[PDB]
Amino acid sequence: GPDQRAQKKGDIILGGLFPIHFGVAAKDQDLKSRPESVECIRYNFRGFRWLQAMIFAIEEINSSPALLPNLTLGYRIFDTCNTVSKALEATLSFVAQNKIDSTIAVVGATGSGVSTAVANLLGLFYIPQVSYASSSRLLSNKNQFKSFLRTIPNDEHQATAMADIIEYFRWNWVGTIAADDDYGRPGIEKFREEAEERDICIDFSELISQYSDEEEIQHVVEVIQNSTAKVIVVFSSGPDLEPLIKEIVRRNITGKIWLASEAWASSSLIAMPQYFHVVGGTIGFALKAGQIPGFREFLKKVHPRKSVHNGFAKEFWEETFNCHLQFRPLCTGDENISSVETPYIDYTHLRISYNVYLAVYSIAHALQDIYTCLPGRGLFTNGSCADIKKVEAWQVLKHLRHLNFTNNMGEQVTFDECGDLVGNYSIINWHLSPEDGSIVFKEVGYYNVYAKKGERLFINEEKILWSGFS
Amino acid sequence: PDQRAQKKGDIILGGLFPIHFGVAAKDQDLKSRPESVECIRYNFRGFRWLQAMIFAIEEINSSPALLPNLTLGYRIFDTCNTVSKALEATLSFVAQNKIDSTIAVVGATGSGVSTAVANLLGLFYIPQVSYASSSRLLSNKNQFKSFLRTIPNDEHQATAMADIIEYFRWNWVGTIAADDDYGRPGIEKFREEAEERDICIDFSELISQYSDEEEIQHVVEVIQNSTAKVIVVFSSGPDLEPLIKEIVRRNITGKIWLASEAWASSSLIAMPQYFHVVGGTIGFALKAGQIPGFREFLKKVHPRKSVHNGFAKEFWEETFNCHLQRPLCTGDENISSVETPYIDYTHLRISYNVYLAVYSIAHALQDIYTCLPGRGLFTNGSCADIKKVEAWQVLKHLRHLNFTNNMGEQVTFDECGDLVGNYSIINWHLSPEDGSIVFKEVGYYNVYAKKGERLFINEEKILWSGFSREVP
Ligand SMILES: O=C(O)[C@@H]1Cc2c([nH]c3ccccc23)CN1
Ligand SMILES: O=C(O)[C@@H]1Cc2c([nH]c3ccccc23)CN1
Ligand SMILES: *[C@@H]1O[C@H](CO)[C@@H](O)[C@H](O)[C@H]1NC(C)=O
Ligand SMILES: *[C@@H]1O[C@H](CO)[C@@H](O)[C@H](O)[C@H]1NC(C)=O
Ligand SMILES: *[C@@H]1O[C@H](CO)[C@@H](O)[C@H](O)[C@H]1NC(C)=O
Ligand SMILES: *[C@@H]1O[C@H](CO)[C@@H](O)[C@H](O)[C@H]1NC(C)=O
Ligand SMILES: *[C@@H]1O[C@H](CO)[C@@H](O)[C@H](O)[C@H]1NC(C)=O
Ligand SMILES: *[C@@H]1O[C@H](CO)[C@@H](O)[C@H](O)[C@H]1NC(C)=O
Ligand SMILES: *[C@@H]1O[C@H](CO)[C@@H](O)[C@H](O)[C@H]1NC(C)=O
Ligand SMILES: [Cl-]
Ligand SMILES: [Cl-]
Ligand SMILES: [Gd+3]
Ligand SMILES: [Gd+3]
Ligand SMILES: [Mg+2]
Ligand SMILES: [Mg+2]
Ligand SMILES: [Mg+2]
């Protein structure tokens, strides 16, 4: 398949898709000569941390004597660049065998639009796909997406929570902005419905994107400038929001209350100190934090030399230390990860990373359910089992549909009729560190998704900066 | 795939068409290996669309002038209006390219299907030309690099709808949309235009061909519990039909249905036994087109004689309600005896789009044949060898194509690969002779006129629940 990858031989292979870059280089093809392949641009350090979590879990599992003793799990992991096209190349390789008529399960993708395209494909071959971050309600539809599950809750809930926060503060006047894609559009539509039920009025509603032109941006900023609304609900990823924010910062638009969907509420592309006068004090959703003992130590052993199997480790290094590998200065090889602050390690809570880790453990546990299957008390015809020596993707899907297990956090992980896994939300507020001068995601409440209306939202008003500054 | 239509040729065109309306929705407990889904309910109008493609190709081969050195071939599959079937087909289209042979594709129908396909063809810069997918999502050329269409996108249609409501001073309307890339974006556009005109929306529900009974009951309840008489519906017939059945069942009467073009002419909904519910709907229709020879071509269909079109056998069986060597078929019987949409039509609209999609591929190939070195489109004005053409060269030529159809019109695609078109506005009457439903034209929408001056309606021509000339 693709040139850049992370890959290790095993008896059973797990596919993986991660956004190691935020995007593709937009040298928009006029098709004057044969199109070469696009280049991926702007390193995503957080995304590399996500990919590490999958490798950590797979290595943790091959070490565990308990879980899958006779066998080893391998992996084939690719960069999507938040791009359907790159993600589809990689996926064509995952199903290369199957298509001619080997990959047992795929962990990914991140953006709901990317996961959709991938799912349309894997679904043809009943290859289970477990996403760590794709939250569009569209993916719950099991007629269209036969093999899709996720370790993240869908956005029906998040959008309802957004409307509940607004009602909580007795606000009744807002604007909305959403990314023009299968994450933003269905999310804000839901929010609209919920806002109406609670007599919350929406004065404007606009769509944006990573690739909006200057005229389209100017227009959105004008609508904003021209509106009495102080509270602006935004349903979007970092990359789709960054152009709008750059212009809003350029024109110095100040003291809006920004309500962030989980995709941008922790994004290092928006939570930048030079934007704080605009973006300070945003309130947003985050997934519940999880714990991976050993992970931080694993992330510090990265090395362009030592790491044979992870072929993303080279460019990681170069990006981190701003050098090149055997004028861009050459790299010693002996530089220290702890000297440069990047999102790779400069984090406090593991949230999406935890989902990656659970996505892998799900696949693993469903394989463990096949290892220990007792003939007669199995899930296939006449109580029969599946042969783990010769396992087929659809059998893992089957096992994933019936899975129930207890995670290191001591929780039961099972998937519903739609392949979703319910979860609660943290509510964070953007403060400025007086120690660092950097932005700090202060936890200020939580939303318990399944609870009687009026007993779901828990907030500490005392803790909130409304402009973000002490 | 087993069931197809194909013929060898120098350059192959792909084709996707909905020969069946859907799939048998048998949910799989995956206790054993899954078998494929079975396509259910034959779509005669869809067979005609596929016929228009084959017609246009043979005609083009017959033309000496257009592409002399070469013959055009075709490999043409059934999507069953399903992403999955369309993608199996598509994987075979790209099979050569992927391994690193198909030069262009015509289709698909449903925006949701063309979306899925377009993601795939786009990797390999294989041009795709849709005769019927009208989602604005498809105008986005960053995501859909190789997509064009011979149908206008719905931006105007949804605005037209809101112009119609403003005109009659209607005030608190209902909305219903198919849950897919046709319905959601159309209604999202409609809502924006309704906001600009201070038109309020009382409800908005989603529907689908595959919605269970609980999901339908709920929509029917929302409708029943509403004061809204005016209901805007953006959907295909097949996704709508389950809803209409239950509405007719509960006798829900005197609604004014505003019909998007995908169902405004649909034989699944335009059925006399629904006329007490569905009568008097107002809707949109594409400009008609003329195809000389085509009617005659449609009558030469034969399970025997048609060696290349492997859909004809099932066509025959479904038409005449027989079996092939549940009575056995003579193999002699007359197509012009049984009334089905295959031949029972007055105007060619989508069929004309199919035709034009094929000729657009053709005319872009022709412009390669006749390229003059130095005056061409590529590097240093260079040209492309037509003996060894590559899909992306056709894409390039298709982006800049400009030619004259048989109706005497200029066919070009804009920066987004779209094509503008006006609309007729039609109203659902009953036939006094026939008892069948009739699409009477009662207005037009002219897309070239300035904002506020695009709609025209003849009030006198409207029958208000199919029958009444007395309004309020
Ligand atoms: O489905 C989607 O597109 C968004 C993508 C996304 C989510 N969380 C994130 C955190 C960082 C970056 C991207 C994301 C949840 N779902
Ligand atoms: O993009 C879509 O899904 C539709 C499907 C469709 C259109 N026109 C039709 C006529 C007959 C049957 C189906 C259709 C236009 N847009
Ligand atoms: C914003 O305000 C000014 C004056 O009110 C107007 O000229 C401008 O066009 C407005 N823009 C938008 C997008 O509403
Ligand atoms: C932005 O606005 C603030 C307060 O409204 C003002 O004090 C400051 O000077 C402005 N910044 C710029 C760069 O104009
Ligand atoms: C998962 O296991 C626990 C007990 O171990 C049980 O309470 C729970 O109901 C199970 N979930 C499902 C969906 O079967
Ligand atoms: C509609 O009306 C009935 C009876 O008034 C009520 O019980 C039901 O909940 C309503 N359903 C909806 C969807 O409004
Ligand atoms: C449905 O109601 C209408 C009166 O509006 C009438 O034409 C028809 O007979 C009714 N049928 C039933 C079964 O109620
Ligand atoms: C197509 O050609 C005609 C004249 O031959 C011209 O009027 C028109 O501008 C052309 N269309 C486009 C889109 O270039
Ligand atoms: C649209 O309508 C106007 C008047 O009916 C006509 O002049 C124009 O050429 C039409 N364009 C079409 C059908 O493409
Ligand atoms: Cl991704
Ligand atoms: Cl189709
Ligand atoms: Gd609610
Ligand atoms: Gd407008
Ligand atoms: Mg092991
Ligand atoms: Mg809007
Ligand atoms: Mg010829």
Side-chain angles (χ1 to χ4, degrees), chain B residues 16-21 41-47 49 77-81 108-110 131:
Chain B
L16 300 171
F17 294 89
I19 308 309
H20 297 86
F21 283 123
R41 310 164 79 212
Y42 199 89
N43 170 20
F44 289 106
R45 190 182 171 177
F47 188 69
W49 297 346
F77 303 92
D78 181 6
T79 58
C80 307
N81 293 309
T109 295
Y131 50 87

Side-chain angles (χ1 to χ4, degrees), chain B residues 127-170 172-194 196-200:
Chain B
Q128 173 183 351
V129 177
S130 188
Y131 50 87
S133 294
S134 51
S135 181
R136 74 155 181 95
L137 298 166
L138 287 159
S139 301
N140 177 183
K141 297 303 93 163
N142 304 294
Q143 176 136 164
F144 314 105
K145 293 174 161 179
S146 91
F147 179 80
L148 321 94
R149 47 177 155 207
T150 57
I151 189 162
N153 87 33
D154 290 313
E155 296 292 271
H156 275 298
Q157 211 187 306
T159 314
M161 262 155 185
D163 280 347
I164 286 170
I165 287 154
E166 188 177 34
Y167 186 84
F168 291 94
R169 331 284 190 173
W170 295 331
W172 272 88
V173 311
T175 61
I176 291 159
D179 209 0
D180 60 50
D181 286 339
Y182 169 69
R184 299 186 308 257
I187 219 71
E188 141 232 75
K189 174 65 167 170
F190 172 66
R191 181 170 227 114
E192 174 196 316
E193 299 304 315
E196 277 150 32
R197 290 172 182 72
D198 300 323
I199 286 149
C200 297

Side-chain angles (χ1 to χ4, degrees), chain B residues 409 422 446 448:
Chain B
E409 297 267 274
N422 295 331
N446 167 31
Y448 303 88

Side-chain angles (χ1 to χ4, degrees), chain B residues 23-25 28-34 36 39-68 70-71:
Chain B
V23 155
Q28 265 149 335
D29 52 14
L30 297 174
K31 263 190 152 65
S32 75
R33 166 142 46 262
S36 86
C39 289
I40 221 70
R41 310 164 79 212
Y42 199 89
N43 170 20
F44 289 106
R45 190 182 171 177
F47 188 69
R48 163 160 41 94
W49 297 346
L50 165 162
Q51 288 273 243
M53 172 163 165
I54 296 177
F55 183 87
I57 285 161
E58 273 156 13
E59 180 168 309
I60 283 166
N61 284 337
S62 293
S63 189
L66 204 71
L67 296 184
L70 318 173
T71 53

